[PDB]
Symmetry: D2
Subunit: 212 residues, 4 copies
């Protein structure tokens, strides 16, 4: 009688977040005290940056897609206590100060927990905690065209800096760390959130876990 962990990985702009968000919307799970399906984001677990790390982040020279940018120790400790059925405190990152807010999110033992992140399967110890591993596979240049429109129309970034960072940081980090972990996935979901047959296949299964 433990929480069912489902790990979700894939490249940036592949549709991870929309896939998981569509699942819980489809179940209807959005009371936080009594919710049975919950979503954890790797983005919650960014390390606290030093003043040298803060300063390069302003000049765009920090690599937020590198595994060194994330608190693997915290992620493992948080996800182990979740499989042990405890309540855990999820950090709330303040990107302005590039540190953690003292205030923190409280998540209770849910029957199924979704953990989505680009490097979710990177660490083996974290990787063995997942009962089910899902990989959102969409084409490298399809993902790029999505990320470019997101960063301009939603975040208002400069086009050249977008593409320069993608080639310097995002692309290598995905090819060196993320994509090597595709083989660890039990089930591969192509094309992301538009793939409704795959989403409904996952949706029903979570209810069967919720039903019994």
């Amino acid at each position: 009688g433990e929480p069912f962990l489902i790990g979700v990985s894939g490249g940036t702009a592949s549709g991870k977040s929309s896939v998981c968000a569509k699942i819980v919307q489809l179940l209807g799970q959005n009371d936080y005290r009594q919710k049975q399906v919950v979503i954890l984001s790797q983005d919650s677990f960014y390390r606290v940056l030093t003043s040298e790390q803060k300063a390069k982040a302003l000049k765009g020279q920090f690599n937020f897609d590198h595994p060194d940018a994330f608190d693997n120790e915290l992620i493992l400790k948080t996800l182990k206590e979740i499989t042990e059925g405890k309540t855990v405190q999820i950090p709330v990152y303040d990107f302005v100060s590039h540190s953690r807010k003292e205030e923190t999110v409280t998540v209770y033992p849910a029957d199924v927990v979704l953990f989505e992140g680009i490097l979710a399967f990177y660490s083996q110890e974290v990787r063995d905690l997942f009962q089910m591993k899902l990989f959102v596979d969409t084409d490298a240049d399809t993902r790029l065209s999505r990320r470019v429109l997101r960063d301009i129309s939603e975040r208002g970034r400069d086009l050249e800096q977008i593409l320069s960072q993608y080639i310097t940081f995002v692309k290598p980090a995905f090819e060196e760390f993320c994509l090597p972990t595709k083989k660890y996935a039990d089930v591969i979901i192509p094309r992301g959130a538009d793939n409704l047959v795959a989403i409904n296949l996952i949706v029903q299964h979570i209810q069967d876990i919720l039903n019994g």
Copy 2:
């Protein structure tokens, strides 16, 4: 009414082992033949009857049994079309050595779930669009070939020299020219085949709800 599921992938990817394990876990080897709710169809059954010009190239060894032309696309369509209507259809039996369909024919009663597996299940738009769920088994090209080699010595009596020369000349190009460009039509992708237990129970549990719905 019946739920059709298309399974595809290259040879030795494990599609046949996937389906066999799926119906096995559903207890379908205990349900009687006329009462089976889950049935497995193979594209290998629908090989065309080869012409005497086709058989000439086959006996020589210049025929490609992984090419789209070697399969009876129209009969597959008609049969699968008639399956969806709840009609009982009759499945031909193919004699490989004679490249013709035997006078014997197999009966399949309408099951609630139908699994059709084959290297070219998704090649034709018309057959492709009859699958409510399309599964692809995505095993590495060198891993599959390793299984094929061990397979084609226990299954048949042939040289190592024979298997690889045939695979390089016939099986490899037909996979890449025809099978692989159809992976884009897959709804779900099952990496390693019957080895992937998580994926199988997920389809097994999905089929249970369909049966129990």
Copy 3:
């Protein structure tokens, strides 16, 4: 006989930039312009002529200019195989925007080495055999797209949403279906494009050895 070198690669992979560099390190830009030893023929010059019902599809942005059907294979084959025979040829001149086969032509005197660069330079079997050496520029799919986006915005005054929708709808499928499967036929693959000075000097120096005897 003229030494024909066919250069292929996806869009924005750096084919033209490599071809322009090769002749620029050889010394043709500072030379008597008529009858250069080496000449670059771009496949874009040989676009097909039909544009009334196609112009109906083409004008709004509903046309695929990346499809092989849009390229005069027979003219390609005619001009190239005539160039091999040592003849002088006339090359069409085109407006990329207006679908214009201008009345004028560019007269190309026969050269010792001829570079033919195009996305589908290796597509048709007949034109492919005319090439002594076949080069392919293997720039990654997202790297090419980032180069492509920056070029169209700056050099063509075009906006992102149309550029990206044109690339996803048209450029991407045609490359994967037609251009990418012809990497099989390349003799030498050049990884990154026009910065790869080691591969450029290797081929620049090889041509010099053909020019020098």
Copy 4:
């Protein structure tokens, strides 16, 4: 005056050794006496490690990955190649035993040196020593068939172990260590020894370096 270092990498049975073997034969370099060769070939396999007793224990149990970067004397490769650029006569080991070597092989300062190995571009220090880097990119299932034949003919081991070792050790090492180093190549050579257009391209370049520019 400093020797020209050419790095050749690529998977097992990609054709590395043959490409280097063919290129020196076409230059007639094995005709000359050992004391006055102008191009020489160095194999990464000659520089395997003398490994610790803890590493001996994993090796004796049949569970050591000889395709892993740790199994090669990175420091010996780096110093030997560096002393060759210093025009010094050097000494190379003979065959990782079946974890030591006895005699040595004298290698006098050659004008061009070909270093071939699955991980020749892996270490940045040794990778930065090559004035030209070539990658021989043969497909995975194609490279397997070549190797499973090569392993049977030259070694004689039974089939079930050759395939089991490739899937367990060779395949993962290639994709983790060799494959990521392809992006460092200056030129990619598609099929190996049979690619005589590319071979003759490289044979010609070395002939120019050997005399004049």
